[PDB]
Each structure stands twice: as C-alpha cells, then as structure tokens.
Design a protein around this ligand. Structure first.
Ligand SMILES: N=C(N)NC[C@@H](O)CC(=O)C(=O)O
Ligand SMILES: [Cl-]
Lengths: 369, 353
C-alpha cells in the first residue's frame, strides 16, 4: 500500500523516532543558529537587493565550498528550482522531447526512476559494479539517449571517481549521449569534491548536473535544487523551467549563502565528524547481532543501509513501528528488481545522536527476536 | 520599474513585519512541533479566512506543494493518461495552458461570456475530460458566481468530466469567498481545486500551492505528488498560518483597501487619455487590464521598456487566439504605491504622445 519510498516516509514525519527520510533534522550548530537569529536582517536584505545578486552569491558560495570551481557562473546557466525533485521533473519532461530510453544507476533514490518513467522514459538499469568498474557497452550507449548517475549514490554512498566520470563523459561525447548527474549527497564525501564541471567540460559531452542544498544542513527543508546544463544540452530545460517557476525566494538563496559560508569556515568538517559519529553509534549498536551486516562499509553519506539474514526489511520495519521507531525498507531503491532490497532497511543519520541511539537500541532488540 | 509579474512586492504592513521579526521563534516552533499540526493549522487559518469552511480537513486531502504551478504540473501529468482534451477558460494565466499542452493535453477554449452566462453544451462536455476554470480569473478578475459553479459542477458530474479550479486570486475578491467546497461536494463531480497563498502577501515568494481533490477524483494526483515532494517547509506553513491570522484580524480588509487604492491610482492617471478604456471595471484582483485604441500592447510594451518601465502585453493570456489581446496591456497592482504611480505616469505620457 506504500507505492514508493516517500509514502513510507510520510508515516514517520510526525514521530519522535523518525529515522526514515533523509532530510537533516539534527540540532543547529551555534554558528547556524546565529544565521537563524539574523533572519529578519536577511529578509530586509532580500527586499532591498536584486535577486540576481543574491542568487549569484549563493551559487558561488555553495559550488566553491564543495570544490566545483569550474561551474558556469554566467547568469542563466544555473537554474534555481524549489527542490532537486522539481529539477528532476524539468529534466525528465525535457528528455522526453527527444529521448526514448535512459540508463540509470540501480539502486538509487526511487523518485528519479518514478519521475523518468512518469514522463514516458524507458529505463535500463546499470548496477553499481558495472557503472564503476567498466566502460559502458557500445550496445547500451547506442540504445539510450541519457546516462543518469547519482553520486554519491543514495542509498549506497558510492562515489563515482574522477577517472570513471572522465571515461563516462568521453563515452557519452563519442555517442552523442546526455550525461546527467544527481549530486545531492556531494557535501558529505570529500571524494566527490574534485571539480566535476572541469571533467564534463573537458570531455565535451552534453551534460546536466542537479545539485541540491537540501540534504546537508538542518534548514527545515528550505533549499534549492540547482539545475546546471551544458550550452549544447539540446533539451528544452530552460523553457520547461520557465513554465514551472520564475525563480526561488531570495530569502532561501540568502540562507544558502550564509549556511555555505558557515560550512566553509569549519562547519563542513564538523558535519563530517558528526555523520561519522552517528554512523559509528549505529554500527556499534548492531555489532554482534547475529545475521546483521553493513553493505556499504566505506559510505560517508547521511543514510546507512543495514542487512539482515532471516527476515525482510518490511517485517523489521513493522516490528520497529510497534515501538514507534520509523525506518525505511530498502526494496523500492531497487527500482528495477525490488527483491534485491528485501533484506535491508535504511537508517537516517542526519539526526540528533540521542534519538538515533534510542532508535537503534530498539532495532537491536527487534533484531534479536 | 517592474509592474509586470503579479507577485506581491509592496512593503510589509506593521503586523506583517512583526511576524518577520519573530522568524527565529517560528523556526524553533518548526523544529519542535510535528509538521502535521503546523500544516493543519495553516490550512485551517487560510481556508477559514476566505470562507472555505467545507474544505476537507482530514490529513492527506489537502496536498501542500511548493507552488501552485507545481500543483498544476502534478494535475496536468495526472490528467494525461486518461484525458485527451481539456476545456480551459480563455483568456487566462498562460502557464496553465503551457503546462497542460506540455503534458500532452489538447485545449479547447471557453470564452468568459459563455462560461458565466449559460450552461456548457453537451457537445463540449461529452468531448473533454476536464473543465478548468481560473476564478477569480487572471487577468480579468472575473469571478465564477455560486449559482454558475453549482451548475457547472452538476454538468461535469452528468458527463463524467473533472472540474478543476485555480483559485490563486481568491483572497482579493469577497465575491469568491462563498464556500466552493460545499458546492463541489454537494454536486458530486470529480473535482480538484488548486489554492495559492503566493499572490496575496509580500512574503518574498515564500508560499504554497494547496492541491485539494475529491475522494473519487480517479487520477494519480497523490502518487505523482509523492514522486515530487515529501511536503513543504514547516517554516513556510507557519508563516502562512501567521499571515492568515493577521489577515483575519483586519489585514485582509487593509489589503483590499490597498489594492483598491492602487487600482484607483492607475485609472485616475489614465482616465482622460484618448483611446484608453478599462475592460474590467468591477475587478478587485491585483492586476489591471488597460485597453487602448490605436496601438498594440506589444508596441506600448516596447515604448515603456525604453523608459525602463516593464509591464506585460496581453497577447499571451489569449492562449488560443493571441490577437484577441494585442490592444491591451496588464499592470501589476501588488506594488508600493510610489513606484506604481511613477510607472503609470510614464505610461500616460507614452499614450499621450
Ligand atoms: N519524492 C521526494 N522528493 N521524497 C523526499 C526525498 O527527500 C526523500 C529522499 O531522497 C531520502 O529520504 O533520502
Ligand atoms: Cl501573474
């Protein structure tokens, strides 16, 4: 009855022990609270300055924070959207104008697949081992109009390394294929902070990148998706963007600018240490629980998969919920073969440590019948 | 300056500035309380402010979207599997036509005098899967009266047709504050209403579209909504709640007087100019059409742009027959009175030369 992962996440939104959706819900740091305290000043700034200047500063702050120095800074090359999923809707409807089939990393966050399928795109799954480990086949590339990679991936944290991004972009250029990247989790893993735009521009393929500010910081879902495209993208992303929105709030762009600057001043290192700490409490709690393992030992992302022998993630979820703890079954990240995720759940790490600790102690008991 | 887009850009009232000064408190509330409570309170405040007492208050029946256009994208995509043709009021907000067409729907225009003045024909209704009405209409301000909404809903029920309403301008016109949901539920057609908080108040485009649907809508609106978002920011919902409460305490009356004053400024400025008329004398909406014989709205737009004034030509609103609008421009009234007056003074000079 839960048609997708988001519908599993609705069930948790109002619970104290929500460890389901991946949004950031931990406490603000002192530096971030200082930003919140200045919201009336930022409001006045947003009333008084041209939105284009605030937007340009927000983009410069966010891209540079995360190593993306070669981003196209000319006005109009970065389209600020209400969310990364709104960017994805724009991209999907734009692709449907000239593309029939898309190669998509599998597993990945399921709304990517659902927005593409919903706009009439046929999907070809590419497992992570194939994507990272070998060139894509000429047969595949000649059969799709777009290759779509989430990096760092959600839910696995796997990062597309620079040498493979380079080869994939060269392959897409050689075939005339669009290379599309979803980089929502970029800020969590320094392995993703090499300059992706330099790689894409050097290879000269058609490309689109959807950045997302929303997952990094606890901003009450005040965020933007940033839809960045090559000059030769040859899809109607600008026209469809303008059918959906004029732009995002200057106050949100001002907030992104300020949170990005705080992150550059030491906040990002603190965030990495916080996520590492919370990952450690999860793994320590589910330590010698017979049948438990962690499929992504090297992940640095803000979500964590846990596997179990002998039960399904749906059953674990239901016993958890009877204790008012809400996690996420993994089936639906495996959008081409949901049974691949039948023995995993996903835990959200962007949470205050104390309710996270409480939730995984409950999971430890459940997982011990 | 900008008298083009319809968004609210006037200064905050003192009551609204107090809300903004307390944003850090609203932030703490949004961290601490269940979003569902904040959302229910925001919906209750907004629907009750505007007379919509019968709205479905059960959680999940009102879907909070980033914007009304996001709601419209959801609706357009949701229609596309089962509906080939949509009857759409003409003229209207051109984004609605472009979102419907972009999702594969063919459009049939319904002129305003036909929509308001008589029942729709069986031929039309049996040939479309959805009838879409913007009320109060943008750009004309024309309000669908209760008796006509009831008949239109009854006719859509009789023909198995979805009735969809876009009510973004609702807050500006008390004629649109009769309870639309009571009518829709009593008629028993499949229906969707897209409310919008965005155009009423100068909130720096912090807003929500509210996608409301009948239990039997029979379209994948909930599924496609969940493909796009988990929900809107609790801070924005809290802001909507507070601005709605301020409006209920006298702010809405002040807004109506402010819009009336700015409408009066525009008309007094242009009253005597040869060839100028106002096609919508009873409109209370936050945009104003100005008609003028002798020039095209495109030519007038061009001339204003030379003097650094940005209005809108009306062609685009006549999405089925753009020439229907090339003797009109549209002026935005949700502006501080001083820059509006400056803009209209340039327009008067342009029209007198
Ligand atoms: N359809 C959408 N947009 N769902 C919300 C999204 O933020 C969930 C997600 O990606 C996660 O929990 O990791
Ligand atoms: Cl408008």
């Amino acid at each position: 009855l839960k048609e997708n992962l988001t519908q599993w996440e609705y069930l948790a939104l109002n619970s104290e022990l929500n460890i389901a959706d991946g949004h950031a819900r931990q406490a603000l740091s002192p530096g971030q609270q200082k930003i919140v305290n200045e919201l009336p000043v930022l409001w006045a700034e947003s009333e008084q300055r041209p939105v284009q200047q605030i937007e340009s500063e927000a983009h410069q702050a966010y891209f540079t924070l995360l190593g993306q120095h070669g981003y196209p800074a000319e006005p109009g090359r970065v389209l600020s959207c209400y969310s990364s999923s709104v960017s994805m809707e724009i991209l999907a409807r734009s692709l449907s104008a000239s593309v029939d089939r898309v190669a998509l990393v599998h597993p990945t966050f399921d709304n990517i697949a659902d927005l593409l399928r919903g706009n009439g795109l046929d999907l070809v799954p590419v497992e992570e081992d194939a994507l990272h480990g070998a060139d894509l086949s000429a047969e595949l590339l000649s059969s799709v109009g777009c290759v779509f990679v989430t990096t760092p991936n959600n839910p696995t944290g796997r990062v597309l390394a620079e040498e493979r991004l380079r080869r994939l972009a060269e392959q897409c250029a050689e075939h005339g294929t669009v290379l599309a990247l979803d980089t929502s989790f970029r800020g969590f893993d320094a392995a993703a902070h090499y300059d992706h735009y330099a790689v894409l521009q050097e290879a000269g393929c058609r490309w689109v990148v959807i950045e997302d500010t929303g997952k990094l910081w606890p901003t009450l879902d005040l965020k933007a998706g940033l839809l960045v495209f090559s000059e030769d993208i040859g899809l109607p992303v600008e026209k469809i963007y303008s059918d959906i929105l004029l732009g995002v709030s200057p106050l949100i762009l001002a907030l992104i600018r300020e949170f990005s600057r705080d992150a550059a001043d030491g906040g990002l290192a603190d965030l990495h240490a916080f996520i590492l700490h919370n990952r450690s409490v999860v793994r320590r709690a589910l330590a010698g629980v017979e049948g438990v393992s962690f499929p992504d030992p090297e992940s640095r992302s803000s979500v964590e998969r846990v596997a179990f022998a002998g039960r399904t993630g749906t059953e674990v979820w239901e016993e958890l919920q009877r204790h008012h703890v809400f996690a996420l079954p993994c089936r639906q990240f495996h959008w081409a073969e949901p049974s691949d995720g039948d023995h995993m759940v996903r835990i959200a790490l962007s949470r205050s440590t104390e309710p996270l600790e409480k939730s995984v102690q409950v999971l430890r008991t459940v997982l011990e019948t």
